[PDB]
Amino acid sequence: PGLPPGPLENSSAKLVNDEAHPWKPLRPGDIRGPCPGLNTLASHGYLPRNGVATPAQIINAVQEGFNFDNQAAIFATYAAHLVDGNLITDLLSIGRKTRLTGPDPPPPASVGGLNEHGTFEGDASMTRGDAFFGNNHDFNETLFEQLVDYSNRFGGGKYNLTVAGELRFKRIQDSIATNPNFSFVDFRFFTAYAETTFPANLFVDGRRDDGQLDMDAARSFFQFSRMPDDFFRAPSPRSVTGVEVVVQAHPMQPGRNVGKINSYTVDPTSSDFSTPCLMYEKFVNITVKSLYPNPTVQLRKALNTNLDFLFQGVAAVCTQVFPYG
Ligand code: HEM
Ligand SMILES: *[C@@H]1O[C@H](CO)[C@@H](O)[C@H](O)[C@H]1NC(C)=O
Ligand SMILES: *[C@@H]1O[C@H](CO)[C@@H](O)[C@H](O)[C@H]1NC(C)=O
Ligand SMILES: *[C@@H]1O[C@H](CO)[C@@H](O)[C@H](O)[C@H]1NC(C)=O
Ligand SMILES: [Mg+2]
Protein backbone atom coordinates (compact mmCIF):
# COMPACT_ATOMS: atom_id res chain seq x y z
CA PRO A 1 0.00 0.00 0.00
CA GLY A 2 1.18 3.48 -0.85
CA LEU A 3 1.18 6.15 1.81
CA PRO A 4 -1.90 8.42 1.78
CA PRO A 5 -1.21 11.48 -0.37
CA GLY A 6 -0.91 14.80 1.38
CA PRO A 7 -2.94 17.94 0.75
CA LEU A 8 -2.61 19.92 -2.46
CA GLU A 9 0.45 22.13 -2.74
CA ASN A 10 -1.71 24.66 -4.64
CA SER A 11 -5.44 24.50 -3.86
CA SER A 12 -6.64 27.43 -6.00
CA ALA A 13 -9.56 27.19 -8.37
CA LYS A 14 -8.47 26.12 -11.83
CA LEU A 15 -9.84 24.53 -14.98
CA VAL A 16 -10.18 20.80 -14.33
CA ASN A 17 -12.09 19.94 -17.52
CA ASP A 18 -8.85 20.49 -19.43
CA GLU A 19 -7.10 18.99 -22.43
CA ALA A 20 -5.39 16.31 -20.31
CA HIS A 21 -8.72 15.22 -18.75
CA PRO A 22 -11.40 15.04 -21.45
CA TRP A 23 -14.68 13.31 -20.84
CA LYS A 24 -14.99 10.04 -22.70
CA PRO A 25 -17.91 7.60 -22.90
CA LEU A 26 -17.79 4.20 -21.29
CA ARG A 27 -16.03 1.37 -23.09
CA PRO A 28 -17.33 -2.20 -22.65
CA GLY A 29 -16.35 -3.30 -19.17
CA ASP A 30 -15.79 0.17 -17.70
CA ILE A 31 -17.19 0.33 -14.17
CA ARG A 32 -19.19 3.22 -12.68
CA GLY A 33 -20.98 3.10 -9.36
CA PRO A 34 -23.07 5.00 -6.83
CA CYS A 35 -20.69 7.97 -6.38
CA PRO A 36 -21.04 10.74 -9.00
CA GLY A 37 -17.77 12.24 -7.77
CA LEU A 38 -15.63 9.19 -8.40
CA ASN A 39 -17.66 8.39 -11.53
CA THR A 40 -16.84 11.81 -13.00
CA LEU A 41 -13.17 11.54 -12.10
CA ALA A 42 -12.96 8.17 -13.88
CA SER A 43 -14.86 9.50 -16.91
CA HIS A 44 -12.34 12.37 -17.19
CA GLY A 45 -9.25 10.22 -16.64
CA TYR A 46 -8.39 11.60 -13.20
CA LEU A 47 -8.92 7.96 -12.21
CA PRO A 48 -8.35 4.95 -14.48
CA ARG A 49 -11.22 4.99 -16.92
CA ASN A 50 -12.17 1.37 -16.18
CA GLY A 51 -13.24 2.38 -12.66
CA VAL A 52 -10.66 0.32 -10.73
CA ALA A 53 -8.13 2.30 -8.74
CA THR A 54 -5.77 2.28 -5.77
CA PRO A 55 -6.61 4.29 -2.64
CA ALA A 56 -3.77 6.70 -3.42
CA GLN A 57 -5.12 7.21 -6.93
CA ILE A 58 -8.55 7.98 -5.48
CA ILE A 59 -7.22 10.49 -2.94
CA ASN A 60 -5.13 12.30 -5.55
CA ALA A 61 -8.06 12.39 -7.99
CA VAL A 62 -10.63 13.79 -5.54
CA GLN A 63 -8.17 16.49 -4.44
CA GLU A 64 -6.91 17.44 -7.89
CA GLY A 65 -10.22 17.22 -9.75
CA PHE A 66 -12.62 18.57 -7.12
CA ASN A 67 -10.59 20.06 -4.22
CA PHE A 68 -11.99 17.52 -1.73
CA ASP A 69 -10.10 18.09 1.49
CA ASN A 70 -7.34 15.74 2.55
CA GLN A 71 -8.78 14.42 5.83
CA ALA A 72 -12.20 13.68 4.22
CA ALA A 73 -10.50 12.03 1.23
CA ILE A 74 -8.41 9.78 3.52
CA PHE A 75 -11.34 8.78 5.76
CA ALA A 76 -13.76 8.01 2.90
CA THR A 77 -11.20 6.24 0.70
CA TYR A 78 -9.75 3.92 3.39
CA ALA A 79 -13.19 3.20 4.83
CA ALA A 80 -14.40 2.15 1.36
CA HIS A 81 -11.22 0.18 0.64
CA LEU A 82 -11.33 -1.70 3.99
CA VAL A 83 -14.92 -2.96 3.39
CA ASP A 84 -15.17 -3.08 -0.47
CA GLY A 85 -11.63 -3.27 -1.85
CA ASN A 86 -8.85 -5.86 -2.17
CA LEU A 87 -6.34 -5.22 0.62
CA ILE A 88 -3.65 -7.48 -0.89
CA THR A 89 -3.73 -6.02 -4.46
CA ASP A 90 -4.56 -2.46 -3.19
CA LEU A 91 -7.41 -2.19 -5.73
CA LEU A 92 -10.96 -0.92 -5.29
CA SER A 93 -13.81 -0.93 -7.82
CA ILE A 94 -15.90 2.28 -7.78
CA GLY A 95 -18.93 0.18 -8.68
CA ARG A 96 -19.67 -3.49 -9.18
CA LYS A 97 -17.67 -6.44 -7.96
CA THR A 98 -15.03 -7.40 -10.50
CA ARG A 99 -12.29 -9.96 -10.92
CA LEU A 100 -10.15 -6.93 -11.89
CA THR A 101 -9.45 -6.31 -8.15
CA GLY A 102 -7.61 -9.64 -8.04
CA PRO A 103 -7.86 -12.92 -6.14
CA ASP A 104 -10.51 -12.63 -3.44
CA PRO A 105 -9.86 -13.16 0.28
CA PRO A 106 -11.87 -15.82 2.07
CA PRO A 107 -15.51 -15.53 3.12
CA PRO A 108 -16.93 -13.68 4.91
CA ALA A 109 -15.10 -10.85 3.06
CA SER A 110 -17.02 -9.75 -0.07
CA VAL A 111 -14.67 -7.27 -1.95
CA GLY A 112 -17.83 -6.13 -3.71
CA GLY A 113 -16.83 -2.66 -4.83
CA LEU A 114 -18.66 0.51 -3.90
CA ASN A 115 -21.91 -1.19 -5.11
CA GLU A 116 -21.80 -3.50 -2.08
CA HIS A 117 -24.85 -2.67 -0.01
CA GLY A 118 -24.47 -2.18 3.71
CA THR A 119 -20.70 -1.65 3.92
CA PHE A 120 -20.34 1.92 2.62
CA GLU A 121 -23.32 2.30 0.23
CA GLY A 122 -26.71 2.59 1.81
CA ASP A 123 -30.30 3.73 1.69
CA ALA A 124 -31.98 7.09 1.04
CA SER A 125 -29.52 8.13 -1.67
CA MET A 126 -30.65 11.17 -3.63
CA THR A 127 -30.40 9.89 -7.26
CA ARG A 128 -29.90 6.15 -6.69
CA GLY A 129 -32.53 3.73 -5.37
CA ASP A 130 -32.29 1.62 -2.27
CA ALA A 131 -30.78 -1.87 -2.84
CA PHE A 132 -34.16 -3.44 -1.85
CA PHE A 133 -35.68 -1.95 -5.08
CA GLY A 134 -33.13 -3.71 -7.33
CA ASN A 135 -30.42 -1.17 -8.16
CA ASN A 136 -28.35 0.89 -5.70
CA HIS A 137 -25.90 2.31 -8.25
CA ASP A 138 -27.36 3.51 -11.58
CA PHE A 139 -28.69 6.99 -12.01
CA ASN A 140 -32.46 7.12 -11.55
CA GLU A 141 -34.41 9.69 -13.62
CA THR A 142 -37.47 9.68 -11.32
CA LEU A 143 -35.26 10.42 -8.30
CA PHE A 144 -33.34 13.12 -10.18
CA GLU A 145 -36.65 14.74 -11.27
CA GLN A 146 -37.56 14.89 -7.56
CA LEU A 147 -34.20 16.60 -6.89
CA VAL A 148 -35.11 19.10 -9.68
CA ASP A 149 -38.57 19.59 -8.11
CA TYR A 150 -37.07 20.24 -4.62
CA SER A 151 -34.53 22.63 -6.27
CA ASN A 152 -37.46 24.49 -7.90
CA ARG A 153 -39.41 24.62 -4.60
CA PHE A 154 -36.60 25.44 -2.11
CA GLY A 155 -33.63 26.69 -4.17
CA GLY A 156 -35.13 28.97 -6.83
CA GLY A 157 -34.29 26.30 -9.41
CA LYS A 158 -30.83 25.55 -8.00
CA TYR A 159 -29.66 22.88 -5.57
CA ASN A 160 -28.34 24.44 -2.36
CA LEU A 161 -28.16 23.43 1.31
CA THR A 162 -31.84 24.43 1.88
CA VAL A 163 -32.85 21.96 -0.86
CA ALA A 164 -30.46 19.38 0.62
CA GLY A 165 -32.17 19.66 4.03
CA GLU A 166 -35.63 19.09 2.51
CA LEU A 167 -34.64 16.35 0.01
CA ARG A 168 -32.58 14.42 2.57
CA PHE A 169 -35.67 14.16 4.81
CA LYS A 170 -38.00 13.32 1.89
CA ARG A 171 -35.73 10.38 0.86
CA ILE A 172 -35.66 9.14 4.48
CA GLN A 173 -39.48 9.30 4.69
CA ASP A 174 -39.81 7.57 1.32
CA SER A 175 -37.54 4.71 2.45
CA ILE A 176 -39.43 4.38 5.76
CA ALA A 177 -42.74 4.14 3.80
CA THR A 178 -41.58 1.63 1.13
CA ASN A 179 -38.40 -0.25 2.16
CA PRO A 180 -39.09 -2.78 4.95
CA ASN A 181 -35.29 -3.31 5.21
CA PHE A 182 -34.44 0.42 5.45
CA SER A 183 -31.29 0.91 7.56
CA PHE A 184 -30.09 4.36 8.68
CA VAL A 185 -27.53 3.83 11.47
CA ASP A 186 -23.78 4.34 12.14
CA PHE A 187 -21.72 5.04 9.00
CA ARG A 188 -24.68 5.46 6.59
CA PHE A 189 -26.36 7.90 9.03
CA PHE A 190 -23.23 10.11 8.71
CA THR A 191 -22.61 9.70 4.95
CA ALA A 192 -26.29 10.29 4.02
CA TYR A 193 -26.09 13.83 5.47
CA ALA A 194 -22.52 14.51 4.25
CA GLU A 195 -23.22 13.55 0.62
CA THR A 196 -26.12 16.07 0.37
CA THR A 197 -23.58 18.89 0.83
CA PHE A 198 -21.21 17.76 -1.93
CA PRO A 199 -23.17 19.00 -4.95
CA ALA A 200 -23.34 22.50 -3.34
CA ASN A 201 -19.68 22.48 -2.21
CA LEU A 202 -17.89 20.62 -5.06
CA PHE A 203 -20.08 20.57 -8.24
CA VAL A 204 -20.45 24.39 -8.23
CA ASP A 205 -17.89 26.10 -10.49
CA GLY A 206 -15.11 27.44 -8.19
CA ARG A 207 -15.10 30.90 -9.83
CA ARG A 208 -18.56 31.34 -8.22
CA ASP A 209 -18.41 28.96 -5.17
CA ASP A 210 -21.87 30.34 -4.19
CA GLY A 211 -23.47 27.02 -3.16
CA GLN A 212 -26.04 27.18 -5.96
CA LEU A 213 -25.85 24.24 -8.37
CA ASP A 214 -27.76 24.57 -11.66
CA MET A 215 -29.71 21.56 -12.92
CA ASP A 216 -27.75 21.29 -16.22
CA ALA A 217 -24.51 20.83 -14.21
CA ALA A 218 -26.33 18.57 -11.74
CA ARG A 219 -27.56 16.25 -14.53
CA SER A 220 -24.08 16.32 -16.16
CA PHE A 221 -22.42 14.97 -12.97
CA PHE A 222 -25.20 12.72 -11.57
CA GLN A 223 -26.23 11.06 -14.83
CA PHE A 224 -23.29 11.38 -17.33
CA SER A 225 -20.27 11.58 -15.00
CA ARG A 226 -19.31 14.66 -16.93
CA MET A 227 -17.93 17.98 -15.84
CA PRO A 228 -19.55 21.00 -17.43
CA ASP A 229 -17.52 22.51 -20.26
CA ASP A 230 -14.94 24.91 -18.76
CA PHE A 231 -15.56 23.56 -15.24
CA PHE A 232 -13.31 25.09 -12.58
CA ARG A 233 -12.94 23.15 -9.33
CA ALA A 234 -13.71 24.73 -5.95
CA PRO A 235 -11.24 27.42 -4.83
CA SER A 236 -10.17 25.76 -1.55
CA PRO A 237 -10.29 22.30 0.02
CA ARG A 238 -13.62 21.23 1.45
CA SER A 239 -16.05 18.39 1.88
CA VAL A 240 -19.00 18.63 4.30
CA THR A 241 -19.17 22.35 5.10
CA GLY A 242 -22.84 23.27 5.65
CA VAL A 243 -24.00 19.80 6.77
CA GLU A 244 -25.28 21.50 9.95
CA VAL A 245 -27.94 23.23 7.75
CA VAL A 246 -29.12 19.85 6.38
CA VAL A 247 -29.36 18.25 9.87
CA GLN A 248 -31.08 21.33 11.35
CA ALA A 249 -33.85 21.29 8.74
CA HIS A 250 -35.18 17.92 9.98
CA PRO A 251 -33.10 16.36 12.76
CA MET A 252 -33.28 12.59 12.83
CA GLN A 253 -32.23 9.79 15.17
CA PRO A 254 -30.46 6.72 13.74
CA GLY A 255 -32.63 3.70 13.28
CA ARG A 256 -34.15 1.22 10.88
CA ASN A 257 -37.34 -0.34 9.67
CA VAL A 258 -37.67 -3.74 11.38
CA GLY A 259 -38.85 -5.96 8.51
CA LYS A 260 -41.99 -3.95 7.73
CA ILE A 261 -42.66 -0.57 6.18
CA ASN A 262 -43.51 2.28 8.61
CA SER A 263 -41.68 0.56 11.51
CA TYR A 264 -38.79 3.00 12.02
CA THR A 265 -37.18 2.02 15.33
CA VAL A 266 -34.40 4.04 16.92
CA ASP A 267 -31.15 2.15 17.64
CA PRO A 268 -29.66 3.44 20.91
CA THR A 269 -26.43 1.51 20.18
CA SER A 270 -25.87 3.51 17.01
CA SER A 271 -23.49 6.38 16.89
CA ASP A 272 -24.98 9.79 16.02
CA PHE A 273 -23.55 13.31 15.51
CA SER A 274 -22.96 13.60 19.29
CA THR A 275 -20.65 10.53 19.14
CA PRO A 276 -18.43 10.75 16.05
CA CYS A 277 -15.62 8.64 17.61
CA LEU A 278 -18.11 5.82 18.27
CA MET A 279 -18.87 5.77 14.50
CA TYR A 280 -15.15 5.14 13.81
CA GLU A 281 -14.83 2.50 16.58
CA LYS A 282 -17.93 0.56 15.42
CA PHE A 283 -16.80 0.78 11.78
CA VAL A 284 -13.51 -0.89 12.72
CA ASN A 285 -14.62 -3.23 15.56
CA ILE A 286 -17.85 -4.43 13.88
CA THR A 287 -17.97 -3.70 10.12
CA VAL A 288 -14.31 -4.38 9.22
CA LYS A 289 -13.82 -7.16 11.79
CA SER A 290 -16.98 -8.96 10.59
CA LEU A 291 -15.50 -9.18 7.04
CA TYR A 292 -12.06 -10.25 8.39
CA PRO A 293 -12.67 -12.09 11.70
CA ASN A 294 -9.40 -14.14 11.80
CA PRO A 295 -7.16 -13.04 8.94
CA THR A 296 -4.03 -14.79 7.81
CA VAL A 297 -0.68 -12.98 8.20
CA GLN A 298 -0.60 -11.06 4.87
CA LEU A 299 -4.23 -9.89 5.20
CA ARG A 300 -3.68 -8.88 8.85
CA LYS A 301 -0.67 -6.76 7.79
CA ALA A 302 -2.72 -5.08 5.00
CA LEU A 303 -5.68 -4.52 7.33
CA ASN A 304 -3.45 -2.89 9.99
CA THR A 305 -1.76 -0.63 7.42
CA ASN A 306 -5.11 0.49 5.94
CA LEU A 307 -6.58 0.93 9.49
CA ASP A 308 -3.63 3.23 10.37
CA PHE A 309 -4.41 5.27 7.23
CA LEU A 310 -8.12 5.35 8.08
CA PHE A 311 -7.20 6.75 11.51
CA GLN A 312 -5.28 9.63 9.91
CA GLY A 313 -8.64 10.78 8.47
CA VAL A 314 -10.52 10.65 11.75
CA ALA A 315 -11.49 14.32 12.28
CA ALA A 316 -12.81 14.09 15.83
CA VAL A 317 -10.11 13.89 18.49
CA CYS A 318 -10.39 10.15 18.85
CA THR A 319 -8.32 7.28 20.18
CA GLN A 320 -7.21 4.64 17.75
CA VAL A 321 -8.56 1.10 18.15
CA PHE A 322 -6.67 -2.07 17.17
CA PRO A 323 -8.87 -5.08 16.30
CA TYR A 324 -5.93 -7.31 15.31
CA GLY A 325 -3.55 -6.22 18.08
C1 HEM B 1 -13.04 10.45 -1.46
C2 HEM B 1 -13.50 9.26 -1.83
C3 HEM B 1 -14.99 8.97 -2.05
C4 HEM B 1 -15.55 7.79 -1.85
C5 HEM B 1 -14.86 6.49 -1.39
C6 HEM B 1 -16.94 7.89 -2.17
C7 HEM B 1 -17.90 6.88 -2.12
C8 HEM B 1 -19.27 7.07 -2.27
C9 HEM B 1 -20.27 6.03 -2.13
C10 HEM B 1 -19.99 4.56 -1.86
C11 HEM B 1 -21.45 6.59 -2.31
C12 HEM B 1 -22.82 5.90 -2.23
C13 HEM B 1 -23.50 6.37 -0.93
C14 HEM B 1 -24.98 6.26 -1.25
O1 HEM B 1 -25.50 5.12 -1.06
O2 HEM B 1 -25.59 7.26 -1.74
C15 HEM B 1 -21.31 8.00 -2.56
C16 HEM B 1 -22.27 8.96 -2.77
C17 HEM B 1 -22.06 10.26 -3.19
N1 HEM B 1 -20.84 10.88 -3.44
FE1 HEM B 1 -18.96 9.98 -3.16
N2 HEM B 1 -17.14 9.19 -2.59
C18 HEM B 1 -15.97 9.91 -2.53
C19 HEM B 1 -15.75 11.23 -2.88
C20 HEM B 1 -16.69 12.08 -3.42
C21 HEM B 1 -16.45 13.36 -4.03
C22 HEM B 1 -15.02 13.93 -4.14
C23 HEM B 1 -17.64 13.87 -4.41
C24 HEM B 1 -17.95 15.20 -5.12
C25 HEM B 1 -17.05 15.86 -5.84
C26 HEM B 1 -18.67 12.90 -4.07
C27 HEM B 1 -20.04 13.08 -4.28
C28 HEM B 1 -21.03 12.17 -3.88
C29 HEM B 1 -22.45 12.37 -3.91
C30 HEM B 1 -23.14 13.69 -4.30
C31 HEM B 1 -23.05 11.26 -3.45
C32 HEM B 1 -24.57 11.07 -3.31
C33 HEM B 1 -25.15 10.41 -4.55
C34 HEM B 1 -26.65 10.34 -4.36
O3 HEM B 1 -27.14 10.23 -3.20
O4 HEM B 1 -27.40 10.46 -5.36
N3 HEM B 1 -18.05 11.80 -3.51
N4 HEM B 1 -19.94 8.26 -2.55
C1 LIG C 1 -36.27 4.69 -10.02
O1 LIG C 1 -36.93 5.22 -8.88
C2 LIG C 1 -38.36 5.15 -9.00
C3 LIG C 1 -38.94 5.86 -7.81
O2 LIG C 1 -38.47 5.32 -6.58
C4 LIG C 1 -38.75 3.67 -9.09
O3 LIG C 1 -40.17 3.58 -9.14
C5 LIG C 1 -38.12 3.07 -10.34
O4 LIG C 1 -38.45 1.70 -10.47
C6 LIG C 1 -36.61 3.22 -10.29
N1 LIG C 1 -35.96 2.67 -11.47
C7 LIG C 1 -35.87 3.17 -12.70
C8 LIG C 1 -35.10 2.34 -13.67
O5 LIG C 1 -36.39 4.23 -13.03
C1 LIG D 1 -31.39 28.37 -1.56
O1 LIG D 1 -32.03 29.17 -2.53
C2 LIG D 1 -33.22 29.81 -2.03
C3 LIG D 1 -33.82 30.54 -3.20
O2 LIG D 1 -32.84 31.36 -3.82
C4 LIG D 1 -32.85 30.75 -0.88
O3 LIG D 1 -34.05 31.25 -0.31
C5 LIG D 1 -32.08 30.01 0.20
O4 LIG D 1 -31.57 30.93 1.16
C6 LIG D 1 -30.91 29.24 -0.40
N1 LIG D 1 -30.25 28.45 0.63
C7 LIG D 1 -28.92 28.46 0.80
C8 LIG D 1 -28.17 29.40 -0.08
O5 LIG D 1 -28.36 27.76 1.63
C1 LIG E 1 -13.34 -1.38 20.03
O1 LIG E 1 -12.40 -2.34 20.49
C2 LIG E 1 -11.47 -1.80 21.44
C3 LIG E 1 -10.48 -2.90 21.74
O2 LIG E 1 -9.75 -3.26 20.58
C4 LIG E 1 -12.23 -1.32 22.67
O3 LIG E 1 -11.31 -0.71 23.57
C5 LIG E 1 -13.28 -0.29 22.27
O4 LIG E 1 -14.06 0.09 23.39
C6 LIG E 1 -14.19 -0.85 21.18
N1 LIG E 1 -15.12 0.17 20.73
C7 LIG E 1 -16.41 -0.03 20.47
C8 LIG E 1 -16.90 -1.44 20.56
O5 LIG E 1 -17.16 0.89 20.18
MG1 LIG F 1 -27.27 4.29 -1.50
UniProtKB/Swiss-Prot annotation:
Q: How does activity depend on pH?
A: Optimum pH is 4.7 with ABTS as substrate. Optimum pH is 7.2 with benzyl alcohol as substrate, and there is another optimum at pH 6.2. Optimum pH is 7.2 with dimethoxyphenol as substrate. Optimum pH is 6.0 with naphthalene as substrate. Optimum pH is 7.0 with pyridine as substrate. Optimum pH is 7.0 with veratryl alcohol as substrate, and there is another optimum at pH 5.5.
**One Pfam family cited in the UniProt record for this chain:** Peroxidase_2
Q: How is the cofactor bound?
A: Binds 1 heme b (iron(II)-protoporphyrin IX) group.
Q: Where are the transmembrane segments?
A: none
Is-annotated flag, keyword Iron? yes
Keywords noted in UniProt: Disulfide bond, Glycoprotein, Heme, Hydrogen peroxide, Iron, Metal-binding, Oxidoreductase, Peroxidase, Signal
Gene Ontology molecular function: heme binding; metal ion binding; peroxidase activity
Cofactor entry: heme b
Say which enzyme class the record assigns.
oxidoreductase
InterPro entries in the record: Chloroperoxidase, Chloroperoxidase-like_sf
* Binding positions for heme per the UniProt entry: 35
Which positions are glycosylated?
Answer: 10, 140, 160, 181, 285
Mod. after translation: N-glycosylated.
> Which cysteine pairs are joined by S-S bonds?
277-318
Catalyses which reaction(s) = RH + H2O2 = ROH + H2O
EC number(s) stated in the UniProt entry for this protein? 1.11.2.1
Entries under PANTHER family matching the protein: HEME HALOPEROXIDASE FAMILY PROFILE DOMAIN-CONTAINING PROTEIN (PTHR33577:SF16), STERIGMATOCYSTIN BIOSYNTHESIS PEROXIDASE STCC-RELATED (PTHR33577)
What is the similarity comment for this entry? Answer: Belongs to the chloroperoxidase family.
This chain's protein is named Aromatic peroxygenase
Source species of the chain: Cyclocybe aegerita
Q: What is the lineage of its organism?
A: Eukaryota, Fungi, Dikarya, Basidiomycota, Agaricomycotina
